[PDB]
From Swiss-Prot, chain A:
UniProt protein name: Multidrug efflux pump subunit AcrB
Family of the protein in this entry: Belongs to the resistance-nodulation-cell division (RND) (TC 2.A.6) family.
Protein's organism: Escherichia coli (strain K12)
Subunit-structure text: Homotrimer, with large domains that extend into the periplasm, interacts with AcrA and TolC. AcrA may be required to stably link this protein and TolC. Interacts with AcrZ. Part of the AcrA-AcrB-AcrZ-TolC efflux pump.
Gene deletion effect: Loss of susceptibility to contact-dependent growth inhibition (CDI); inhibiting cells still contact the target.
Residues of the full protein shown: 854 to 903 of 1049
From Swiss-Prot, chain E:
Function: AcrA-AcrB-AcrZ-TolC is a drug efflux protein complex with broad substrate specificity that uses the proton motive force to export substrates. (Microbial infection) Involved in contact-dependent growth inhibition (CDI), acts downstream of BamA, the receptor for CDI. Its role in CDI is independent of the AcrA-AcrB-TolC efflux pump complex.
Organism of derivation: Escherichia coli (strain K12)
Topological domains, Periplasmic: 6-13
Subunit structure: Homotrimer, with large domains that extend into the periplasm, interacts with AcrA and TolC. AcrA may be required to stably link this protein and TolC. Interacts with AcrZ. Part of the AcrA-AcrB-AcrZ-TolC efflux pump.
Transmembrane spans: 14-38
Effect of deleting the gene: Loss of susceptibility to contact-dependent growth inhibition (CDI); inhibiting cells still contact the target.
Annotated compartments: Cell inner membrane
Similarity remark: Belongs to the resistance-nodulation-cell division (RND) (TC 2.A.6) family.
Record's protein name: Multidrug efflux pump subunit AcrB
UniProtKB/Swiss-Prot annotation, chain F:
Protein family: Belongs to the resistance-nodulation-cell division (RND) (TC 2.A.6) family.
Domain of life: Bacteria
Name of protein: Multidrug efflux pump subunit AcrB
Induction: Positively regulated by MarA, Rob and SoxS transcriptional regulators (at protein level).
Annotated TM spans: 1-15
Species of the source: Escherichia coli (strain K12)
Subunit and interaction comment: Homotrimer, with large domains that extend into the periplasm, interacts with AcrA and TolC. AcrA may be required to stably link this protein and TolC. Interacts with AcrZ. Part of the AcrA-AcrB-AcrZ-TolC efflux pump.
Amino acid sequence: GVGYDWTGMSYQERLSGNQAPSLYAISLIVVFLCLAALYESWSIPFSVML
Amino acid sequence: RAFSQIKDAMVFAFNLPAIVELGTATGFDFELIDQAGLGHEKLTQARNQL
Amino acid sequence: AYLFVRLPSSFLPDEDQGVFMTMVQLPAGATQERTQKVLNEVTHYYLTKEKNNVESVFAVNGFGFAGRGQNTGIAFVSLKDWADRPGEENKVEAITMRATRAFSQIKDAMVFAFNLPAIVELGTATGFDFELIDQAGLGHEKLTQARNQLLAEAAKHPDMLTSVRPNGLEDTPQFKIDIDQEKAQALGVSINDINTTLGAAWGGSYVNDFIDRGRVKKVYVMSEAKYRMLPDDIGDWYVRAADGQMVPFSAFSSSRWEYGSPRLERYNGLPSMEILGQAAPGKSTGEAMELMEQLASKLPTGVGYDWTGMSYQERLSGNQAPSLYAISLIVVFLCLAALYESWSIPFSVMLVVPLGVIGALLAATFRGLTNDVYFQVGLLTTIGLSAKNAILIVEFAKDLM
Amino acid sequence: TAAAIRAELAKMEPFFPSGLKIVYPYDTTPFVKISIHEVVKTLVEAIILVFLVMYLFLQNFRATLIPTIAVPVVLLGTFAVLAAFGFSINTLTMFGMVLAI
Amino acid sequence: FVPMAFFGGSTGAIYRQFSITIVSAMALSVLVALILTPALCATMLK
Amino acid sequence: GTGVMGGMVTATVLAIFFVPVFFVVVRRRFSRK
Amino acid sequence: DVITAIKAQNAQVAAGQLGGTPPVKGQQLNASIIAQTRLTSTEEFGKILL
Amino acid sequence: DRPIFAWVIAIIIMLAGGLAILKLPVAQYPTIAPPAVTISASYPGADAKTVQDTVTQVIEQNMNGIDNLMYMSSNSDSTGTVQITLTFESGTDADIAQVQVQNKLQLAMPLLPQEVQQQGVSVEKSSSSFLMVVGVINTDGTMTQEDISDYVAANMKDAISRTSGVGDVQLFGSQYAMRIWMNPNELNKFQLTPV
Amino acid sequence: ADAKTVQDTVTQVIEQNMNGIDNLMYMSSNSDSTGTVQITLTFESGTDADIAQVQVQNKLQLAMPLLPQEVQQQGVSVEKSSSSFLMVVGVINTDGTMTQ
């Protein structure tokens, strides 16, 4: 009969983690796209995205 | 240094964290709860044990 | 148009939930002992002769809708999955049917078992909820009579039928202790001392709070049930005087049985009893409410009428089906000339629409059913998608012109 | 709600003593878990029924792919413009999504 | 479609539970089968 | 969807040739003016 | 003495019930008890004893 | 018009479209409620006629100047309880039609007997329907009705009523109280009174 | 009053009435020996500082008379928190010293 809880601290739900991988995931899907708007194909999406 | 060096009672001198509060960088704030309905004295011991 | 007026409308249809509940109610001031006898007789049915449909019975005694009391009680029912009960005979549709039959068939007290109306509340389909108000400031007894008089003429119409019943009706005999103020003041007892005795010993008293193994809880003083079961127990209660000795009841009190209401109700700051009714197997609302309007108008002064259910307020199919297609029509008729021009096209399509609306009332009638708010969306897509069949041959052709 | 009435209930399960098995005599959740699973049905076998009936009439995988690549975009787009501005985001709009399908 | 958005009061917005969306479908269908579809036609076809 | 599929066969068989559709660019455009 | 005797006579009190909440197994009738009630007229106020 | 775009517009409206399906779980309905705000008072032991005159009528008297409002109903019961449900216009503000009703009661509060105060009084939002009934039953050393309903309140209920958008939690039973069951004869013997 | 009393007599009575407050994240308390206690209801980032204010006040408005009449008239207040100051403005004396 002791349990545990956090309030500080323990966010709640934020920080760099969970707000740095899914950030550049939805950034990437955008980044990769319209590197073909007037450029076309998968020809440009590697000439810049990396 | 000078305060904590020699004194009968504890003294700090923190810096204002550039906001209202919450989430320093690597900090945490734990909390231990009386769940089953034990005594305050019975709780404080588990606090000491932790 | 004939297949239309004959086909009744539909609100949002009474749909099965995979869970339903019953309704238990007892007569004039029954005990917690007598209602449990009925709840056990209900919890039995679902567990004995309906094992393959009923998952759980959550019988609650003392609950009941329209208010709690030692006279009500209701039971919640969980049903055995969805695939575990194949046929119509196996689900809420008719599970309630024998339940309503078996309960009401033989019983000393009334029992129902309704189905959850697929929402929170308000507006079934053809339902009504009347309310009779004390306007001039008559007595509650003088009001209840006009309530009975209205229930007398309304039920007097099985022709142009209705089904009307009130709420928590009763008016059960309540025991009145009549304290003689001057007889008590004579023999040394304080009035703010007898009432505390009669109050705390029979009703109970919230004295103070106390801590129980971690948290603050209540301290109630009431007294053993042995000495508060019957009117004769009032006598053997003793109250101390200024002399320093015990004067009992009856020596200063009077014992009388008298009628009173267990549930008084008020609509908008005025004393008002509620009456719940029906439409008729033939006519619905528009006339079911209309005849009810002046059944109250043809009785005792200071009575009035009001509705809350039900009576919307301002909605339904009416007023939200003619003006709907009026502003739909003005739009429909227009831009049947956007790139088509003139009044040439506004008849090549705007009245091609009654092809789709044909059945529709064939599908809605010759398949049982009734015109609902998905018919009132399907009837509305069989208009626009029919245009890509109509305005896409008048345009697909006339572009040859 | 509802996903969180269970939330507290989930964390107080271990501190329970002898014989505290929490049951569910009455719950609404089941059907909203189904009022999605039964309309994904009338969407998937709608799509299956879509690139069929195309092999009849027009014929060919290389031509039946075109009218079927359009259907995710319109559906995905419709539950995006529910939130838009200051209106919807519901079921019945997902049940009635099928009538618009 | 749309205009049912000037509805009643307790049948809340059941006709706006969609005179739109079948417009959020139609106009989006009008546009999705406008921007796309011609582009999907003359690519892999014949 | 019963009002749709029914509202279909009554406007996919009774519209395709029957009554209106066809009396539309012909009977309803002119015949008068 | 006028005031004190007014609220003493013109009073509405909440008494218990015949066959209350925790009953005796075999209790048949359940009825509410009415003791004093609020005086409603000028005549009843005139009869308030001092 | 040409190719490599459009498909990207179809990449959006599906990703941005599927970002709005991340609304999982998402509700069943469409809220179709002319909103209900209920006030609940409880005079313990008092009859139906008293609780009408002493609390019900006093509350209704103070219901002036509440924005919108459709009607006002009451249920003065013999159990010594009454609820007043103020119904508002479909889509008013469940949060603003709440505080006014509370702040009309806040001037009728001390006109109610101090027996009825401390015995509750509360204003909340209504539905009349339940999402979940969660039965805590015993399958070992049987605790019993009174023992269980106390525990479910002294361990569970507090965490519910104060969480994710709960209107009101009607628990099935009651938490413990120090009950003092008086005896009038062992009370007469020592010249004592329940007072 | 001591720390143990102010927990049982006011702190626990207030916390008992915290049911049905929209949103809410957690609830902390500080029953002190000085005879004071603060209950901080924390809400979701960007709720409504004006609507999350009135509900908390109107849950206390049914726990008000359950508190001793020694503690009432001695304040009770509900406000918005920051834990930080914009300005400290010291009024000091530089003549006929007034005193603390």
